Design a protein around this ligand. Structure first.
Ligand SMILES: [Mn+2]
Ligand SMILES: [Mn+2]
Length: 271
């Protein structure tokens, strides 16, 4: 049998997208029941996000701050919509507490937990299926851990790292994130180097850190010039995007005690 780890909030937003007026708690869980049934799940795990990350915020105070800007400018009607959704998200998360183990730790994101769970009990299953539409989860991809999105109805394995992410492996995808930037999570990257232009430098010189050693890099191009004068930036970005390496840390940030309760809480279900 397999293990399934869903992206509680990500799915919520999907339901919201489809319709931001109708309650979706009921179908929400049913969707996680069919899926679990389908992926021969043995342990279904539901994880939702709650508050900004404590780990990231430290290495970057303005982390996801753009998302706060957006709420600030929302109209009285849209703000209401946002609150409506979240309410429905909470309810969708409460109903879940009746069928699937649901976790939430204020200060810790979801990708930080799912990486821990996988790192923690992954070996106890044949496969591991993560339910999300967030390609950032693809940093956990292996030949025994993949992801499935509804927004496309596509599954994602490792061999597909080039078509879906313009890189060859997890370490690469990371470095590309720490180099190119993540407009979403509000993270500044080298001015001038995107996916295609960034992968090249990664294919030639290596990964972020391997590249740090090598600076200054040759070439007279500005994005190259900019690159050479943005080392400090790569260090910070690498710790914000390298999910599989800093997750434990990201959890211990909100408490060496919380991390413990979560650890025992997982194995309890895994066993
Ligand atoms: Mn997330
Ligand atoms: Mn992103």
């Amino acid at each position: 049998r397999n293990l399934m780890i869903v992206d509680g909030t990500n799915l919520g937003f999907r339901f919201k997208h489809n319709n931001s007026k109708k309650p979706f708690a009921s179908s929400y869980v049913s969707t996680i029941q069919s899926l679990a049934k389908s992926y021969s799940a043995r342990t279904t795990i539901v994880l939702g996000d709650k508050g900004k990350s404590v780990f990231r915020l430290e290495h970057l105070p303005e982390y996801k701050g753009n998302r706060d800007e957006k709420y600030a400018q929302r109209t009285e009607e849209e703000k209401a919509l946002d609150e409506q959704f979240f309410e429905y998200l909470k309810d969708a998360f409460e109903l879940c507490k009746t069928t699937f183990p649901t976790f939430t730790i204020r200060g810790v994101e979801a990708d930080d937990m799912a990486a821990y769970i996988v790192k923690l009990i992954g070996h106890l299953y044949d496969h591991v299926w993560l339910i999300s539409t967030d390609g950032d989860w693809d940093t956990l991809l292996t030949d025994k851990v993949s992801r499935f999105s509804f927004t496309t109805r596509r599954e994602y394995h490792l061999r597909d790292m080039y078509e879906h992410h313009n890189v060859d492996d997890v370490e690469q995808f990371i470095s590309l994130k720490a180099i190119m930037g993540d407009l979403g999570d509000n993270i500044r990257g080298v001015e001038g180097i995107g996916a295609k232009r960034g992968y090249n430098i990664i294919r030639e010189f290596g990964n972020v850190l391997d590249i740090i050693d090598q600076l200054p890099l040759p070439g007279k191009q500005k994005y190259i010039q900019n690159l050479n004068a943005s080392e400090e930036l790569l260090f910070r970005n690498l710790i914000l995007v390298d999910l599989p390496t800093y997750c434990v840390d990201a959890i211990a940030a909100v408490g060496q005690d919380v991390l413990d309760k979560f650890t025992k809480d997982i194995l309890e279900i895994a066993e």
